[PDB]
Amino acid sequence: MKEGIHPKLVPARIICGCGNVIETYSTKPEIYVEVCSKCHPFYTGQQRFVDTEGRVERFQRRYGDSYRKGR
Amino acid sequence: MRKQLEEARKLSPVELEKLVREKKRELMELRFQASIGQLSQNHKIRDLKRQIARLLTVLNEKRRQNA
Amino acid sequence: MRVKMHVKKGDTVLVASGKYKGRVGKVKEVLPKKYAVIVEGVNIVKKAVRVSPKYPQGGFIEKEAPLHASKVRPICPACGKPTRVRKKFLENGKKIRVCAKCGGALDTEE
Amino acid sequence: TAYDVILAPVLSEKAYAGFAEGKYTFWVHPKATKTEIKNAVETAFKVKVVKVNTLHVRGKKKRLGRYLGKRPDRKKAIVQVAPGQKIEALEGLI
RNA sequence: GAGCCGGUAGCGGGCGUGGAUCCCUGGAUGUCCGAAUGGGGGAACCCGGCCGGCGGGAACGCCGGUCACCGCGCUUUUGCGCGGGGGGAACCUGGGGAACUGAAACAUCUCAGUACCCAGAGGAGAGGAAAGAGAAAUCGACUCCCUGAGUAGCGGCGAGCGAAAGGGGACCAGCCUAAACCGUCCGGCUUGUCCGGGCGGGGUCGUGGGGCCCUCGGACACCGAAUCCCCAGCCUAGCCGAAGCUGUUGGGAAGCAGCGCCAGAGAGGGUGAAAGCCCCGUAGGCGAAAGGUGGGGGGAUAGGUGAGGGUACCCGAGUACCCCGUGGUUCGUGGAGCCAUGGGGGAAUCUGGGCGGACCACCGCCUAAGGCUAAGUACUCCGGGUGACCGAUAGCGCACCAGUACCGUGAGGGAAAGGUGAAAAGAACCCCGGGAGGGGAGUGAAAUAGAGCCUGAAACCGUGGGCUUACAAGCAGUCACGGCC
RNA sequence: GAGCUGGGGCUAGGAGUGAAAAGCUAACCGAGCCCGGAGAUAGCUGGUUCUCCCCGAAAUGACUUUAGGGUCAGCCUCAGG
RNA sequence: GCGAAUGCCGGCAUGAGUAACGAUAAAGAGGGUGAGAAUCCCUCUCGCCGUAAGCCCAAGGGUUCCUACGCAAUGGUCGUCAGCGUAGGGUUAGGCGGGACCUAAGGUGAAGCCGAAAGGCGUAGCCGAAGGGCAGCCGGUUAAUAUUCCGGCCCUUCCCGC
RNA sequence: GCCUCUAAGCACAACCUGCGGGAACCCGUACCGCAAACCGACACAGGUGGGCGGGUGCAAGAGCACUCAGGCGCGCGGGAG
């Protein structure tokens, strides 16, 4: 591993697709899109005591950095 | 030579040292023999080896006891 | 006939055989009971070597096979072998006792 | 482990002549350092190690009934004397 | 218990009843490779730095003890002392994850979360005390079996796919931690009264915990190894242990015959052709050890559990929850719920909050966003045993110098050959011959049992004999008859 | 001479290259070779084994991405009435 | 329980004693050794190479090379011949080569950047070349190896000292 | 390698230079080796890297024709034709 989160796990899976709708509107589901993909967050940082970083990931980030900001 | 087992029991540092060393040399003698007396030799070879082997078994036992 | 045995040098009888005339069992193995009763061999009409007289034909052929020999013979011939009752401090004495008896006491004879 | 001995003389013919006037040839623990030769040599036969050279040989062509092989490893090394001393009996011998 | 120097028996030499061969349990170096790690490297081989040693001293060079890397916690000093890693036939958890074929096309669908790449804990993990079930004012951990219907149902509602509570069964410990409040304390910042981290009481099992007031309270409970001692089950060595001989046809007998025999042990094999009484330490029963493993049964070791009301409350998770983007699930898009997460929003302390019915009004339910493990189904490397399971072209391909020969660059493929005889007595010796090999002698019960040598047939080629055949056209044959023998 | 050549290397097999025809890619890669799904699938061909006894088919109908296939109709056989 | 499936495995047949012997670079004699020699040994006539059918280093092969016995298998028959079978012996170098040194491409990789995982990328230092660099040659001796052995002649660095 | 300074020692015992003394290990050669021993499953006339390539003659020359050394006579034979 080398890109999950830092403040927990948000690094993985995704199966999905579509095709089309038109249901409780006029009929059944134009059904189909057998597709697969990724799905994730972002990066950023601050300072320990003169010289630092963070890295981490998104939200978990914001709350967190706040947290150790507390110290 | 369970008796030899005994002598064994008996000696210690430099003792067993040169004992097994010299004895070893003895078997060398044998090595040399590899084409002379031969016939009654046989045993000097097999046994002698077993003997010196013991020599080592002991050194191990003793100095092992030590460290 | 296994890692364990019957009589040893011993001296015993030949039931199903051709001789029956028991006698000195010169040697008996551990596994193949292979025992030589010194009671029926041949010559192996030897090599033609000077190994045997330069004019050879070995004589003492004696490898005894079959195991229908009636081992042990006290004042009694065909008898199985008992075991012990020890009797003395540290006493195996798996001597042979049945009807007559024989244990091959280390004395007068095997 | 440390049983100095490490050899078997070169009962070899051709090798004879050397034994004959100043050098001597033998089979040695396939491994001994050449300086190893010098030492085993020196303390073993109380001599004067001079010129210590080495060669090696494995076996080729031994048919064994239903399968085959050709042998192991025989090591050769030759060392010469300084005066022509030691090895006496051995040499008068073969 | 008295013989052994493994399969080689042969040569040439041996050790041993003052427990030798050997069966077992713990011993010692234990070459070099291989995770390799002192360094490098086409592994199994070449380099090097520290103390010891010896040698011709120094240079050389060996035994030696020596010196990755990782993360990990501690003395964050100068860091010394721990951990992993490397495997493993199948079972196993999660990680990621596919066409065929079906749907007689085939794009939803299908095989399927199946094959396979991976990471990893084990000896088995998995799951494992309920924001459960389910609606009766009912149940009560988790797992696996039978049943639950192949119904309830999911769907180009098509091929198809397909539950769950209950009930029967088996197996039945439950246990915990931050959860500011307590006080303690050290560090704090900066000083008063915030945070930080150690000790705790609190350390929620089916709901309280803390702090104030009063009733309180003065011996039975063991863990998931808390832990130790044992009969330690075994490991491999142990031991006994039932009763016949005479004859007799036979090369043989254990067989036909005679009489005499055993039996809580007529399971079987083995002793020259088919034995309870002959070989077998077996069925008979019993045996046994100072090591390496524990459930039991019991002890002790017992951390830690084990009260009543009152009172303003503060005290299990950083996201529940709701928008869309998705996984599960018997759900394939739908009125579609609950758990589960990728995006954005974005909180409640027991009037709390998800859960039964999309949703709203009810009752009811459970108590979430931490932690631990036993026990019952799986698996088969390895051991034991049994087989209207196999006989050498079936069986593992593989019954014994087959995963080796040999093909392929590597990946990788992947044979064949089981038996002479009862025992070696398996062939002295004579004779043709370079040899093989061939006639004799001996073997012996046989050698048409003779070394690839049991039983040893078909095919094909051969030596001799019978009939038959040179004016003959026909698969074959074959009905007839005549000539031979 | 965009010459030829030994040694040492990197790119590779739904990718490589490629003075590019669809070339060569361990001796026949128009999409490699070994093992695996798997014994894919096979209305098509082959092949489909002792004796004897009874009967005796059709080789047409109907719709079919079927049309050398198939569901139901027509003919057959064994059993009851 | 089976002809039968250009079946599966193993035999055994068939053209066939014809096609074929691997190069049109030819060979003939004498004596020899032999159980037997077109097909081995000497020696004598003779043709073809010679710019190769030369020698030489290297590669790669890894036995074998030799000396001595032997030929039932093997050579595409021979065969008392062998690179065949059996046994024994055979190559040794401070100065030749390669490491005990250098490095490119180039692989590794302490750092570092980076993946659902396995990895991707990688400075530095290292590994990594008949590309770098380095100290000898010639004459003689074995069945057999050589500037490695012997000998003559010419050096090489590193250590102890002075 | 020649220098060219820190480190820092050196400098009194570091380097440059003579003579004496003493050292120097690891793995390598046999032979085949433009080819019956290396690669094509064969004693397969195919391929496979560098060293003058002896001599005569030819204008020149690794081509030519005969040869030097050195290498052969291909390995199944005789026979009429």
CSV table of C-alpha atoms (C1' of nucleotides) in Angstrom, one decimal, chain G:
chain,number,residue,atom,x,y,z
G,1,G,C1',-18.6,-59.7,-23.4
G,2,C,C1',-17.2,-55.9,-28.9
G,3,G,C1',-14.4,-56.3,-37.2
G,4,A,C1',-15.2,-52.5,-36.2
G,5,A,C1',-14.2,-45.6,-34.7
G,6,U,C1',-7.8,-43.2,-41.3
G,7,G,C1',-9.0,-45.8,-32.9
G,8,C,C1',-5.6,-46.6,-28.1
G,9,C,C1',-0.6,-49.5,-26.7
G,10,G,C1',2.5,-53.4,-28.1
G,11,G,C1',4.2,-56.9,-31.4
G,12,C,C1',4.5,-58.7,-37.0
G,13,A,C1',4.2,-58.4,-41.8
G,14,U,C1',4.8,-55.1,-47.1
G,15,G,C1',7.0,-53.5,-51.3
G,16,A,C1',12.7,-55.4,-51.0
G,17,G,C1',16.6,-58.8,-50.2
G,18,U,C1',15.1,-53.8,-56.0
G,19,A,C1',16.0,-47.5,-53.7
G,20,A,C1',19.7,-46.2,-51.0
G,21,C,C1',25.6,-45.3,-48.3
G,22,G,C1',26.0,-38.5,-47.4
G,23,A,C1',29.6,-35.4,-52.3
G,24,U,C1',33.0,-38.0,-59.7
G,25,A,C1',39.4,-35.0,-54.7
G,26,A,C1',41.0,-42.0,-58.3
G,27,A,C1',43.9,-44.9,-56.3
G,28,G,C1',47.6,-49.8,-57.5
G,29,A,C1',51.7,-52.8,-55.2
G,30,G,C1',54.9,-55.3,-51.5
G,31,G,C1',55.8,-57.0,-47.0
G,32,G,C1',53.6,-57.1,-41.8
G,33,U,C1',50.0,-58.5,-37.6
G,34,G,C1',46.0,-61.2,-37.1
G,35,A,C1',40.9,-66.8,-35.8
G,36,G,C1',39.7,-63.3,-40.4
G,37,A,C1',42.2,-58.3,-42.7
G,38,A,C1',39.0,-54.1,-50.0
G,39,U,C1',38.2,-51.8,-45.6
G,40,C,C1',44.6,-51.9,-39.5
G,41,C,C1',50.6,-51.0,-39.7
G,42,C,C1',55.2,-49.8,-42.3
G,43,U,C1',57.0,-48.9,-46.8
G,44,C,C1',56.9,-48.1,-52.3
G,45,U,C1',54.2,-46.2,-57.0
G,46,C,C1',49.9,-42.4,-57.8
G,47,G,C1',45.7,-38.2,-57.8
G,48,C,C1',43.2,-33.7,-54.8
G,49,C,C1',43.9,-29.7,-51.6
G,50,G,C1',47.7,-25.1,-50.7
G,51,U,C1',44.9,-20.2,-50.0
G,52,A,C1',42.8,-24.3,-48.5
G,53,A,C1',40.8,-29.6,-47.3
G,54,G,C1',46.7,-24.1,-43.9
G,55,C,C1',48.2,-23.8,-39.0
G,56,C,C1',46.5,-20.2,-34.7
G,57,C,C1',43.5,-17.7,-30.6
G,58,A,C1',38.9,-17.6,-29.1
G,59,A,C1',33.6,-20.1,-28.6
G,60,G,C1',31.4,-23.8,-27.2
G,61,G,C1',31.9,-29.5,-26.1
G,62,G,C1',33.0,-31.1,-22.0
G,63,U,C1',34.8,-36.0,-22.6
G,64,U,C1',38.3,-37.2,-23.8
G,65,C,C1',44.1,-37.2,-24.7
G,66,C,C1',47.8,-40.9,-23.9
G,67,U,C1',49.5,-46.1,-22.6
G,68,A,C1',47.7,-51.1,-22.1
G,69,C,C1',44.4,-54.9,-22.9
G,70,G,C1',38.9,-56.2,-25.7
G,71,C,C1',35.0,-55.8,-29.8
G,72,A,C1',29.3,-59.3,-28.7
G,73,A,C1',26.9,-52.9,-29.1
G,74,U,C1',28.6,-48.5,-32.4
G,75,G,C1',30.1,-47.0,-37.3
G,76,G,C1',25.4,-46.2,-42.3
G,77,U,C1',28.4,-54.4,-43.7
G,78,C,C1',33.7,-54.5,-43.0
G,79,G,C1',37.0,-54.4,-39.1
G,80,U,C1',42.2,-58.1,-35.2
G,81,C,C1',40.4,-49.8,-36.6
G,82,A,C1',38.1,-45.8,-33.2
G,83,G,C1',36.8,-40.1,-31.4
G,84,C,C1',33.9,-47.5,-29.7
G,85,G,C1',34.4,-51.0,-24.3
G,86,U,C1',37.8,-52.0,-19.6
G,87,A,C1',41.6,-50.0,-16.5
G,88,G,C1',45.3,-47.0,-15.2
G,89,G,C1',48.0,-42.2,-15.9
G,90,G,C1',47.5,-37.3,-18.1
G,91,U,C1',47.0,-30.7,-17.9
G,92,U,C1',50.2,-27.3,-12.0
G,93,A,C1',51.9,-20.0,-14.3
G,94,G,C1',54.4,-13.1,-8.9
G,95,G,C1',55.4,-12.0,-14.2
G,96,C,C1',49.6,-15.7,-20.0
G,97,G,C1',44.3,-14.9,-18.8
G,98,G,C1',40.2,-13.2,-15.1
G,99,G,C1',39.2,-11.7,-10.2
G,100,A,C1',42.0,-10.0,-6.0
G,101,C,C1',41.2,-2.5,-9.6
G,102,C,C1',38.0,1.1,-13.6
G,103,U,C1',33.5,2.0,-15.9
G,104,A,C1',29.2,2.9,-20.4
G,105,A,C1',25.4,1.4,-22.2
G,106,G,C1',23.4,-1.4,-18.6
G,107,G,C1',21.0,-4.3,-13.6
G,108,U,C1',20.9,-3.3,-8.7
G,109,G,C1',19.6,-0.1,-5.6
G,110,A,C1',20.5,3.4,1.2
G,111,A,C1',17.1,8.2,-0.3
G,112,G,C1',13.1,9.9,-2.7
G,113,C,C1',8.6,10.0,-6.0
G,114,C,C1',4.9,6.8,-7.0
G,115,G,C1',0.0,0.9,-6.6
G,116,A,C1',-6.1,-2.3,-4.2
G,117,A,C1',-1.9,-5.6,-3.4
G,118,A,C1',1.8,-8.0,-5.9
G,119,G,C1',5.0,-3.3,-8.4
G,120,G,C1',6.1,1.1,-11.4
G,121,C,C1',9.9,4.8,-11.5
G,122,G,C1',15.5,5.5,-8.8
G,123,U,C1',20.4,9.6,-7.2
G,124,A,C1',24.2,7.7,-4.4
G,125,G,C1',27.4,3.8,-3.6
G,126,C,C1',27.9,-1.3,-5.8
G,127,C,C1',27.5,-5.3,-9.8
G,128,G,C1',28.2,-5.3,-14.2
G,129,A,C1',33.2,-5.7,-20.8
G,130,A,C1',39.2,-9.6,-25.3
G,131,G,C1',35.9,-1.2,-24.0
G,132,G,C1',40.1,0.8,-19.7
G,133,G,C1',44.5,-0.7,-17.0
G,134,C,C1',48.9,-4.2,-15.5
G,135,A,C1',54.9,-6.7,-13.9
G,136,G,C1',58.7,-11.7,-19.1
G,137,C,C1',61.2,-14.2,-23.2
G,138,C,C1',63.4,-18.0,-25.5
G,139,G,C1',66.0,-22.8,-26.1
G,140,G,C1',65.4,-27.7,-23.8
G,141,U,C1',62.4,-32.3,-21.3
G,142,U,C1',57.3,-36.1,-20.9
G,143,A,C1',52.5,-41.6,-23.8
G,144,A,C1',50.7,-37.1,-22.7
G,145,U,C1',50.9,-30.7,-20.4
G,146,A,C1',54.0,-25.6,-21.0
G,147,U,C1',56.4,-18.1,-21.8
G,148,U,C1',53.0,-22.9,-16.2
G,149,C,C1',58.4,-28.0,-15.9
G,150,C,C1',64.0,-27.5,-16.5
G,151,G,C1',67.6,-24.3,-17.8
G,152,G,C1',69.8,-19.6,-19.7
G,153,C,C1',68.7,-14.7,-20.0
G,154,C,C1',64.6,-9.9,-17.8
G,155,C,C1',61.6,-8.0,-14.4
G,156,U,C1',56.8,-7.2,-11.0
G,157,U,C1',54.1,-4.9,-6.6
G,158,C,C1',53.7,-5.7,-1.2
G,159,C,C1',55.8,-6.5,3.7
G,160,C,C1',60.6,-5.8,7.7
G,161,G,C1',64.6,-3.3,8.0
G,162,C,C1',68.3,-0.3,7.1
